[PDB]
Amino acid sequence: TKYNHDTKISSELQKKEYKKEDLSKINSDFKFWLSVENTNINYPVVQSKDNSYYLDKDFYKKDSISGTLFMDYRNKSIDDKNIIIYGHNMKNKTMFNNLNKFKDADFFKKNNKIKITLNGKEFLYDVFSAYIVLKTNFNNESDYQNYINDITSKSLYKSPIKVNSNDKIVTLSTCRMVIHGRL
């Protein structure tokens, strides 16, 4: 078990989160907290003006090979139809490494929910597709519904959770393992 600077910072932020401190004041790019059931994915999510900045920058905007979990710069509101979050596949089993657990059929069968926590509100998304291999914007419902069909059938396993254009979707992607939730 490796204790290094990255693992320390992230466990401290988890604690500030539990002590309900305002993390915006540490980094104005903070958007919400993210956790995934039955994993150690339990991190802060930030947003830059691009999809690159926080690849190599910790929550304090110092260098880090762990980066910070960040949301696609195109995302606007919690009501976006696909909220996309990116994070790394770290070797010490941190960040988005545990997305791999969704490779396990039985694990997948279970209902592990993705939990966005924002402004004292909890948004639960039920995972319904996972696989190894990205749109935030849809011009209308047709494109959307096609996106849903597209990613539903890319799933390694058929989900008992069914999904359509009246649901909102979250997408946890590594930067290649990928999973989609539905609200």
Numbering used by the authors: 29 to 161, 168 to 209, 217 to 224
Sentences from the paper on this structure:
The sortase family of cysteine transpeptidases catalyzes the anchoring of a wide variety of virulence-associated surface proteins to the cell wall peptidoglycan. Sortases, unique to Gram-positive bacteria, recognize and cleave the C-terminal cell wall sorting signal motif (CWSS) of substrate proteins. In the genome of toxigenic C. difficile strain 630, only one functional sortase, the SrtB gene, is present. Recent studies have demonstrated that C. difficile SrtB (Cd-SrtB) can recognize and cleave (S/P)PXTG between threonine and glycine; however, Cd-SrtB cannot recognize the sequence LPXTG and NPQTN, corresponding to the recognition motifs for Sa-SrtA and Sa-SrtB, respectively.
The recombinant 6xHis-tagged C. difficile sortase enzyme with a deletion of 26 residues at the N-terminal transmembrane domain, designated as Cd-SrtBΔN26, was overexpressed in Escherichia coli BL21 (DE3) and purified using an Ni-NTA affinity column. The crystal structure of Cd-SrtBΔN26 was solved at 2.8 Å resolution by using the molecular replacement method, revealing one molecule in the crystallographic asymmetric unit. However, the density map for residues 27 and 28, 162–167, 210–216, and 225 as well as the C-terminal 6xHis tag was disordered. The Cd-SrtBΔN26 structure possesses the sortase-unique protein fold, comprising eight β-strands (β1–β8), three α-helices (H1, H4, and H5), two 310-helices (H2 and H3), and several loops. The characteristic N-terminal helix bundle, absent in SrtA structures and unique to SrtB, is composed of a 13-residue α-helix (H1), a 310-helix (H2), and a loop. The loop connecting β7 and β8 that has been postulated for accommodating peptidoglycan substrate binding was not visible in our structure, implying the flexibility of the large loop. Consistent with previous studies on sortase structures, β4, β7, and β8 of the β-barrel forming the Cys–His–Arg triad of Cd-SrtBΔN26 appears in a concave surface. The catalytic residues Cys209 and His116 are located slightly beyond the C-terminal ends of β7 and β4, whereas Arg217 is anchored at the beginning of β8. However, visualizing the sulfhydryl group of the catalytic cysteine residue in Cd-SrtBΔN26 is essential for facilitating our understanding of the substrate-specific catalysis of Cd-SrtB. Based on our computational model of Cd-SrtBΔN26–PPKTG complex, we are able to identify that the hydrophobic residue Tyr167 in Cd-SrtBΔN26 forms specific interaction with P4 Pro in PPKTG, confirmed by site-directed mutagenesis and FRET-based assay.
